[PDB]
Amino acid sequence: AAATNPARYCCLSGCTQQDLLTLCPYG
Amino acid sequence: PTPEMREKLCGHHFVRALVRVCGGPKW
């Protein structure tokens, strides 16, 4: 968390349900 | 390393994993 762009980050390294949880309930 | 799994949610993969945990009306 707190490194690079949202989806871009979750695409390269990865993103768990939590790291996703912090990017879903917004838009 | 933690009981999680950083999915390489790329583009739609993320928006999907998104609509899963928070289930927003936008996407």
Chain A, nearest residue to B26 by Cα: A27
Asked if B21 and A20 count as a contact pair (C-beta separation under 8 A), the reply is: yes
What residues contact A18, with CB distance under 8 A and at least 6 apart? B4
A25 and B24 within 8 Å at the Cβ level: the answer is: yes
Cα–Cα distance measured from residue B26 to residue B13, given in angstroms and rounded to the nearest whole number: 16
Domains identified in chain B, total number? 1
> How was this structure obtained?
NMR
Cα–Cα distance measured from residue A26 to residue B6, given in angstroms and rounded to the nearest whole number: 20
Q: Looking at residue A17, what DSSP letter applies?
A: H
Residues of B in contact with A14 (CB under 8 A): 5-9
Residue with token string 């933690």: B2
Q: What are phi and psi of A8, to 5 degrees?
A: -55, -45
Q: Which domain holds residue B20?
A: 1-27
CA neighbor of B14 nearest in space, from A25, A11, A27: A11
The two tokens of residue A9 are 């980050």
Chain length of chain B: 27
Residues of B in contact with A18 (CB under 8 A): 4
Cα–Cα distance measured from residue B5 to residue A26, given in angstroms and rounded to the nearest whole number: 22
Q: Does the beta carbon of B16 lie under 8 angstroms from any beta carbon of chain A? A: no
CA neighbor of B26 nearest in space, from A16, A5, A25, A6: A25
